[PDB]
Design a protein around this nucleic acid. Structure first.
Lengths: 458, 458
DNA sequence: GACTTGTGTATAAGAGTCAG
DNA sequence: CTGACTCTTATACACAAGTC
DNA sequence: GACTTGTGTATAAGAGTCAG
DNA sequence: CTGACTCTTATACACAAGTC
């Protein structure tokens, strides 16, 4: 938030809490995180700016047997917890991804596909906290890493307990801030035991419905009972073009279209556990000749009885993609799967660090997104150089010297050409832009310095 | 050479000759090559520096049906031919690589593996010219692109004729400069018809021996006849550590070692075609308990009768890897296989351009490699900024302000940490460094400009 | 000349990718 | 998932700059 | 204290990758 | 191919800064 742009400051805030059992490890962590963040996406070596000291330090740290990766992730998360004190409502977006490897260490790791696959590694189940008003990323609350065994009957616990394990960690970490938190999960979380545990702790959630369950008071499947309700009202959406590549490698187009949805809600009770909760059902009115009609059924602790309360629910769900965006920031962006440590713990400690770097990529774009001047975000020196680099390229929409102009200017330095006329640049473009602006800033300052000590330039 | 660092200048020299049948196409080619070179490795869009004009231009050019990719490659090659006038002896390193794709266009392309593979594309057979004294890259003389058919009996010509086809093109292109040229090829070129054609044109070559052929005057296999000769003398080599990954995915180490070789030569005559030529044989004296003894048998037009003449031959061959280095510069570096044009000709015209970009990556490092001052290569402004950026990092080996220091300084800006204490940075590190130095130079100049118009910085 | 192609602008959307 | 994007191929105009 | 771990330097080499 | 590299994991010293 306040400590973001300056990588060293950022790393102190995230990591100085870490109980690694020696302040030298925590300071080292801080330094390491700092160089990696300044060089998001690149090798440790490249992050060391030619310092043999820092290179050696970084590598010694991530193979350090007194350094607990669990503790690294926990220390970051407590920072999230500290940050989250700022907000009256939060979303806790929850999902699993895989971290996949094929080098020699992969065989010491866990199953991701078939027993024979060379690609092995970890499953990580993550909780990403956003603030609920403007949806900005607060950070990681929780990650469970595990190695799936080759033999399913060697599992200590069933993988589906990951949703409850996460709840247990969030509540513990958030403490009394938990009633502030709304857990968002997809169909994998449509587990009776999971809904039950939330309600029992009086915790808050929006989980999408997969299994047809019956409502006690009507004796009907949730869907049939919800279709009985009066039309709470409607909403139309725009579905954006994209290409599509199926599981067998087959490519098709998905042309943009506009769909319109009828919304309904109701209070519902489930046979199992005699647990009561609410549910919203959005369904498409008159879909075109040959397309899957849209259909969302959402299970929620949240109020649903007014049209607006129900839209709050839909839109809380519409932000679920954000956890995938983190996964992409972790992998493609920060380089989790590009690492090549030769031992599991080494690979873990590194990739642990990289998860908070990932979050910061997200937050960097978010730091520029939202009315007034560029000076609120950039330094005076940053502000002038950007103005020079951008000369001519500024569009008429953009108020001169505004934070909106600063967003675009950086995006353009990152390569952004708005190919879909949406105005929105990827976090990847913003990062390249920021990094470019920062790199050109070295030269700018170097001239300033020399010019300040009375030396002629060129 | 002279026109290299400045991308626009470089592109004019390489491409202003192009007969595309409209000077507008040639100028467009020049512009396109220029932006791509300035942004080696990145997308067309990113290369357009926010110019909608240049983006649209670039894309219109590479889907232009009046633009012949053949002609693009030819125009570059004639520049090579023009450059090569400078040199009294050249190496023409010759080999094939594949350009491989899996997007929708791939199925309109040719076979690279089995009939069923999704990975399809072209085979390209290339001739890379170096000068023979200090081995610097002069450029591409020739490329043959073709699509291997699914059915081997649908081939217009056998693929092994590629060595002769290349000879035919080089001689035509080099004209009377051909007697300056020494063709270097590996075992695939150990074809009787190919040796014969060289000798008949009185062209010059070093080709490694695969098939046991017999010498007429002795009646012995080349190898047995060469082992009869007196020990012309010896030479020892250092073999550098590397990892090894076999075809089935199996990983092993190859530890560094020192090998010593005994050298022999002789004049030889082959039964077929009663063609006479020379041959050198290098073979390892007493290899360690369990390792493949080294063994090179080279067929050559070149003189071989003195120890030194024979070493000239070995070392001419020892530079064969350079064609692989080009292939890597073309693919990984310039991004040939990262392109995603949706039509073969579009994909070809683009990748054609990218092959000369590749060559320039090689030449950029080479432009810094070899006694005196940095000022011989960099501009005064470039020279100062680099000196600032490098403050503290300079080693004692490095004479202050020398071209040797400039090499290291750039390498360090590119991430180079000399992990194998060899002093040699990859072309990839030099490029990142150069690009970084260039990027920081924008800021430096921007401060200069503003400082020159009397505006306060920061 | 008679007719054809490239540029710079502006509008639109198909194809591809990651991760799923 | 109603993902979110960038890469790539289009199309129209007026008008400039080509071939023939 | 008695004993154990991190830093900055310097030396070395195994493991991995591309393209083959 | 005797490829050429970068990434990663080592090891010793003296000495500083930790745990117990």
């Amino acid at each position: 938030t306040s400590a973001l742009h300056r990588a060293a400051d950022w790393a102190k805030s995230v990591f100085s809490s870490a109980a690694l059992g020696d302040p030298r490890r925590t300071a080292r962590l801080v330094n390491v995180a700092a160089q990696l963040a300044k060089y998001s996406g690149k090798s440790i070596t490249i992050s060391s700016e030619g310092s043999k000291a820092a290179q050696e330090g970084a590598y010694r740290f991530i193979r350090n047997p007194n350094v607990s990766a669990e503790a690294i992730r926990k220390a970051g998360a407590m920072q999230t917890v500290k940050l989250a004190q700022e907000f009256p409502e939060l979303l806790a977006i929850e999902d699993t991804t895989s971290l996949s490897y094929r080098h020699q260490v992969a065989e010491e790791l866990g199953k991701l596909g078939s027993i024979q696959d060379k690609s092995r590694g970890w499953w990580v189940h993550s909780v990403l906290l956003l603030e609920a008003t403007t949806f900005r990323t607060v950070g990681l609350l929780h990650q469970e890493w595990w190695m799936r065994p080759d033999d399913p009957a060697d599992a200590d616990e069933k993988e589906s307990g990951k949703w409850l394990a996460a709840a247990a960690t969030s509540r513990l970490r958030m403490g009394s801030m938990m009633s502030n938190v709304i857990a968002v999960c997809d169909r994998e979380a449509d587990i009776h035991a999971y809904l039950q545990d939330k309600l029992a702790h009086n915790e808050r959630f929006v989980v999408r419905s997969k299994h047809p369950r019956k409502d006690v008071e009507s004796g009907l499947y949730l869907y049939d009972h919800l279709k009985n309700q009066p039309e709470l009202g409607g909403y139309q959406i725009s579905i954006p073009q994209k290409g599509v590549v199926d599981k067998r490698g087959k490519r098709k187009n998905r042309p943009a279209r506009k769909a319109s949805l009828s919304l309904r809600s109701g209070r519902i009770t489930l046979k199992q556990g005699n647990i009561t909760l609410n549910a919203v059902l959005a369904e498409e009115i008159n879909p075109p000749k040959g397309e899957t009609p849209l259909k969302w059924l959402l299970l929620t602790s949240e109020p649903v009885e007014s049209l607006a309360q129900a839209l709050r629910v839909i839109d809380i769900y519409t932000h679920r993609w954000r956890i995938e965006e983190f996964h992409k920031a972790w992998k493609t962006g920060a380089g989790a799967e590009r690492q090549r440590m030769e031992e599991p713990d080494n690979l873990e400690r590194m990739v642990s660090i990289l998860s908070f770097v990932a979050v910061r990529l997200l937050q960097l774009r978010e730091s520029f997104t939202p009315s007034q001047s560029a000076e609120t975000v950039l330094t005076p020196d940053e502000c002038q150089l950007l103005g020079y680099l951008d000369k001519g390229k500024r569009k008429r929409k953009e108020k001169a010297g505004s934070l909106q102009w600063a967003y675009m200017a950086i995006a353009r330095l990152g390569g952004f050409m708005d190919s879909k006329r949406t105005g929105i640049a990827s976090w990847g473009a913003l990062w390249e832009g920021w990094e470019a602006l920062q790199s050109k800033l070295d030269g700018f300052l170097a001239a300033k310095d020399l010019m300040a000590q009375g030396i002629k330039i060129g």
